[PDB]
Amino acid sequence: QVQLQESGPGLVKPSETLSLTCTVSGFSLTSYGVHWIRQPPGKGLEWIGVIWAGGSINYNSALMSRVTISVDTSKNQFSLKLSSVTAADTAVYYCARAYGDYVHYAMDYWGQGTLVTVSSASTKGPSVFPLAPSSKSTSGGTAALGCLVKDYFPEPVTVSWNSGALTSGVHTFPAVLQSSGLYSLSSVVTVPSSSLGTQTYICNVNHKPSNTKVDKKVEPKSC
Amino acid sequence: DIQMTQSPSSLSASVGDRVTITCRASQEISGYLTWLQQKPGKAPKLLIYAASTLDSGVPSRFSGSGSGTDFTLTISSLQPEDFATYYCLQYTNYPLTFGQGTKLEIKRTVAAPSVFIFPPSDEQLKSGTASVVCLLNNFYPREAKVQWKVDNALQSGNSQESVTEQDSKDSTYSLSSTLTLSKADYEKHKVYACEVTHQGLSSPVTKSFNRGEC
Ligand code: NA
Ligand code: NA
Ligand code: NA
Ligand code: NA
Ligand code: NA
Ligand code: NA
Ligand code: NA
């Protein structure tokens, strides 16, 4: 099964060099290569370049002077270096499998992408607070509960519930900027209102840029 | 560079409708045109390559045609899970270039929100801040009026809203309104209420609590 997995730094200071790897499995590096694509948040896609199975490289000429692409076939990993980065280079960076000849340069399977934020500011891990279920969050047999994930930088944070066992009815809202310049989001989930005294609910927050992992138990309130 | 021009840039349709998205290339790209689907939060997924070839596993309601400079993506019976942004991509000429994307939004019937409210947690109060969260769950259309009333006084300037993307199964939205006060400000009032007005509600619904009662 074809798999591509990007790995990046999260936060990069301006004018420094961004360094990304893409680790692959499930296909022959003598027959496939990878493209590098990026997507600024909320915008379209921009092809960066491609490295081919024999080592041939093609660049987006707009970025070519700052781009370096390579392969280490012993590690099954490709890499992209982008030098002298600025806020214009903040984006999700994807790698995608490459095949073709000299007339077509096709791509099929993408990795899930890694968000690179270019900022002078320093990273900050979130504070996680319970959104407690109560009669005020109960309609009939359904109760809502959640986690407020507050005051972090940069994006993203990931949120699971009960280590991935609770997925039905989860809404993790898009993050919002606060006037402090830090992000904030909520993850909510609806559960059976009769389960509040028999099932423990724990949100799992991971903020990779600050190497912060929080598990918060959400206990009910009495109103 | 070959400029890829997609139209329309956004598009709303009902479940079951036939929808058509076109891509125009500034130069002849023969048949080397791929269509991609990007669902919110996820990476683009390959739908069609070589203008008309469905990828293994793609539903048959997707279809692609065109040659030269003018290409079309067709969904013959729009399904709720087809909510996404769709991109065309030419790949006969370096640099590879994408269209600007078509965001496909699903029209569904009006659906009322379920309204939930959360008092601030003791942990946060101990740190000097009080966030109050009002939740509108699984509603349609997106337009909603959420008003914070504190002791029957309408608030402004101290709340923020967040809305999810359309649900891939029932096409609804959810929304959060977050009122944030300092602990000192929070402790100056008793009743915290959010009042919700929405097309699906026959009259506005208020969810509230008294500070310190929970
Ligand atoms: Na780096
Ligand atoms: Na583009
Ligand atoms: Na041209
Ligand atoms: Na706080
Ligand atoms: Na709408
Ligand atoms: Na969403
Ligand atoms: Na109403």
Author numbering:
A (entry chain H): 1 to 82, 82A, 82B, 82C, 83 to 100, 100A, 100B, 100C, ...
B (entry chain L): 1 to 214
What does the literature reporting this entry say, word for word?
Here, we describe the humanization of the pan-HLA-DR mAb 44H10, a murine antibody displaying significant involvement of the framework region in antigen binding. Using a structure-guided approach, we identify and restore framework residues that directly interact with the antigen or indirectly modulate antigen binding by shaping the antibody paratope and engineer a humanized antibody with affinity, biophysical profile, and molecular binding basis comparable to that of the parental 44H10 mAb. Here, we describe the structure-guided humanization of mAb 44H10, leveraging CDR grafting methodologies further guided by critical insights derived from the structural characterization of both the parental antibody and intermediate humanized candidates.
While V17 exhibited binding to BJAB cells, we did not detect binding by V14, although both mAbs shared the exact same light chains. Given that the HCDR3 sequences in parental, V14, and V21 Fabs were identical, we hypothesized that differences in HCDR3 loop conformations observed in the crystal structures of these Fabs could be due to differences in support provided by the surrounding framework. In contrast, a bulky phenylalanine found in V14 created steric hindrance preventing this HFR1-stabilizing contact. Unlike wild-type V14, which expectedly did not bind recombinant HLA-DR in BLI experiments, the V14-V71K/F78V double mutant generated a measurable binding signal with a KD of 206 nM. Per-residue root mean square fluctuations (RMSFs) were calculated for each variable domain; in the case of V14, the V71K/F78V double mutation exhibited decreased RMSF values, primarily within the HFR1, HCDR2, and HCDR3, suggestive of lower flexibility and increased paratope stability.
